[PDB]
Design a protein around this ligand. Structure first.
Ligand SMILES: [Cl-]
Ligand SMILES: [Cl-]
Ligand SMILES: [Fe+3]
Ligand SMILES: [Fe+3]
Ligand SMILES: [Zn+2]
Length: 296
């Protein structure tokens, strides 16, 4: 079972710290941003501490890690050239970092059209991806299924397929399947997941899902709000999420929790990943999970 969470990529330890944290939570895989999630400032590859991180990963049996590009990248923006241009440059540099880290996929939010419309946004994403995938590296870009909040592109499998069809080196593209996003966009992953996967298989191909994000939601299906909830405490629920985590179609695909910290106030928030992973390995909902995390 490849099951983990996002973990920190920070400090002098960088990737060594990410592997230590993943082991602390009982993880077998993990996902990192290569720096701050909300900006493009990055350290040199030497300072990412990769050699030491890999030794820790081999020590603790960690594999199949995932990189996530900062969520401020928007190569769908047709009216902010500096934003488009920066995203293109950043992603070319992120591919080089990820090749060094040893990840196979970079998760990327397709982008937001910010008023220009889906068609204009999708054409811009295709242009940007065609500028990025001119390296002959092997790293893939995993387009993330999106919730449909605001002007987000990627809220439907059809939008992803249009991006994929426009890209020249589209064999370098994959998909990251996020259970909260698909649910908030309107797909019935709670009660008809196999039906959702059948639709995905028709339109894209389930073999192209190279990362799964495992998140409950604070809102019911189709709310398009994108507010994650702890496993089993939201509108998707434990039975549905547990079914997805252990699903045969996702065998040997890293499954990555992005659930929220638990706490009384913002100064006492604690990570839930250790106990959510225990709960999912047991396949038994623990209604006390939040009370346990809040006092770990
Ligand atoms: Cl697995
Ligand atoms: Cl933007
Ligand atoms: Fe994401
Ligand atoms: Fe996600
Ligand atoms: Zn989200």
């Amino acid at each position: 079972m490849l099951l983990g969470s996002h973990v920190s990529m920070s400090g002098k330890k960088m990737l060594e710290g990410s592997a230590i944290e993943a082991h602390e939570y009982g993880e077998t895989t993990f996902m990192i941003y290569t720096g701050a999630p909300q900006n493009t400032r990055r350290k040199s590859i030497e300072d990412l501490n990769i050699t030491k991180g890999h030794e820790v990963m081999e020590k603790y049996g960690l594999s199949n890690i995932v990189v996530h590009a900062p969520y401020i990248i928007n190569i769908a923006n047709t009216t902010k050239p500096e934003t488009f241009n920066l995203g293109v440059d950043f992603l070319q540099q992120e591919i080089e970092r990820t090749q060094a880290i040893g990840a196979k996929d970079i998760v990327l939010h397709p982008g937001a059209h910010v008023g220009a419309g889906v068609d204009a946004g999708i054409n811009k994403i295709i242009e940007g991806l065609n500028e990025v995938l001119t390296n002959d590296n092997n790293v893939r870009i995993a387009l993330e299924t999106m919730a449909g909040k605001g002007t987000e592109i990627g809220r439907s499998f059809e939008e992803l397929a249009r991006i994929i069809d426009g890209v020249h080196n589209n064999e370098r593209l994959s998909v990251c399947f996020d259970t909260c996003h698909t649910h908030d966009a309107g797909y019935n992953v709670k009660e008809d997941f196999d039906g959702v996967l059948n639709e995905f298989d028709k339109i894209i191909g389930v073999d192209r899902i190279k990362v799964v994000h495992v998140n409950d939601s604070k809102n019911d299906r189709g709310a398009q709000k994108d507010r994650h909830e702890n496993i089993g405490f939201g509108y998707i629920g434990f039975d549905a999420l547990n079914y997805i985590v252990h699903h045969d179609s996702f065998k040997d695909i890293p499954k990555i929790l992005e659930t929220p910290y638990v706490g009384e106030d913002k100064k006492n928030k604690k990570p839930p990943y250790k106990l959510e992973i225990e709960m999912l390995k047991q396949q038994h909902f623990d209604p006390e999970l939040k009370n346990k995390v809040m006092q770990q």
